[PDB]
Amino acid sequence: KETAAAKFERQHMDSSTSAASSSNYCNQMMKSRNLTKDRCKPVNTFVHESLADVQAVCSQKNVACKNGQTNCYQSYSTMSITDCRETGSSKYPNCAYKTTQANKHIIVACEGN
């Protein structure tokens, strides 16, 4: 019930697709991942890489986090990601999100979990 590690997996992992397929991807995913349950989560990123590859970022480039903490890591390589963002025409419970597909280096915070 929810460990920090399982929570990251639920909110950001989507290894079953190489990339967002349509404009409706964020709407279906935000929902099935239970991100629109209580409210509408405003912003969320989905990574389309294997779990192992995403876990491997924690052994990659050490960088400072936006808060000053230094447990952040940047992937050496670019990864397939999908940015999900609430539109201005979104309202609980009719959550609407704009899907933006991209290939970027991801930055994650890691914990010896």
């Binding site: 920090a4 590690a5 929570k7 990251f8 909110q11 950001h12 990123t45 990574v47 995403v54 876990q55 970022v57 924690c58 052994s59 986090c65 936006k66 952040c72 990601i81 940015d83 991209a102 970027k104 280096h105 991801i106 930055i107 994650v108 915070a109 890691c110 914990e111 010896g112 979990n113």
Partner: peptide, 11 residues
């Protein structure tokens, strides 16, 4: 082990 707990950024 040492695993991702938060998605900070992209690029």
């Amino acid at each position: 082990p040492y695993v991702p707990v938060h998605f900070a950024a992209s690029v």
